[PDB]
Write a protein that binds this ligand. Sequence first.
Ligand code: HEM
Ligand code: HEM
Lengths: 151, 151
Amino acid sequence: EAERKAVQAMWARLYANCEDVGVAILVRFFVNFPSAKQYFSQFKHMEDPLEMERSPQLRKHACRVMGALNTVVENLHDPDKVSSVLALVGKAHALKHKVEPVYFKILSGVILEVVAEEFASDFPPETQRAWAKLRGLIYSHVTAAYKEVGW
Amino acid sequence: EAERKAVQAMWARLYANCEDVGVAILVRFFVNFPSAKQYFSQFKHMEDPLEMERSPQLRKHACRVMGALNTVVENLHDPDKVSSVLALVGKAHALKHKVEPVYFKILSGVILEVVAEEFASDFPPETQRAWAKLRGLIYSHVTAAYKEVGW
Ligand code: HEM
Ligand code: HEM
């Protein structure tokens, strides 16, 4: 549990650096995993990262992703707050966007780098772990959500 | 004091809508007050709002503005937390950027609209006031900062 402070404190800085990381993340996700771009009308067909870094849609989504991940992160202390936040996301993505679930695990993977990258000798020993686990909370809560919904 | 909750709650929604308002604000400020654009190397010479809405620099600054205003807003309850946050900003802007102080009062003015605009029958009676006062805290703390620094 307490490994969370290590996460909550790392995430807080990350989420306020104003060097939009959510977009760096979304862009790295789509270059490395081009198939995930069909779900987005505006940039389905973009191949240049810079052209992606500019897409309004990609930017609104990064924001939405970072926005919900912070609520989660900021409330790792309330298991039900996590459950609901992630459950709603899962539901919406399964029923509305029909996004293949595995993409949540992969995107989280990308988030784990860009953090590991940016923390310093800082990005962690055993905490590289806290972020492994959190990458667990995000994928299991979302997968269960896909279940209830019946995927 | 308590008028703050009205502000803190309105600001919270505003700061998380993902329809980047900080940029809408910065862009409205510069169209209506073109002289304030000399302080920025990247867009000193831009005349089209859309071309402004895209400027990386304008975007990093909006973020920085919104970032500090939230800390302030989020701590109206701690007068010294406000003092320090606004004091640092004032100092930096006076000594580093040499920005005419009055621009802080004017930009706040712009922020007051875009909020009044966006809240509904919501944007307030007496609270239109809470935001008038807060627009006071921001300008007096910054002006004093310019003083200490000796402008
Ligand atoms: C870290 C996990 C993620 C979070 C927290 C997240 C959060 C959000 C939120 C709050 C919205 C607005 C949803 C709506 O009303 O439809 C959204 C939209 C969307 N998400 Fe995600 N999302 C995540 C991962 C993904 C992944 C992996 C994909 C796969 C490519 C994806 C594809 C979409 C699409 C297509 C939309 C609708 C786009 C639009 O309306 O412009 N999301 N997401
Ligand atoms: C709501 C009030 C404002 C806040 C909270 C705010 C906050 C910030 C922060 C955190 C930075 C980074 C500062 C640095 O290291 O230099 C910054 C930079 C800057 N601000 Fe502001 N600012 C505000 C108003 C203004 C106004 C009214 C102007 C006048 C045009 C202005 C012009 C600048 C400039 C030129 C920079 C440096 C730009 C760069 O490095 O790209 N700011 N501000």
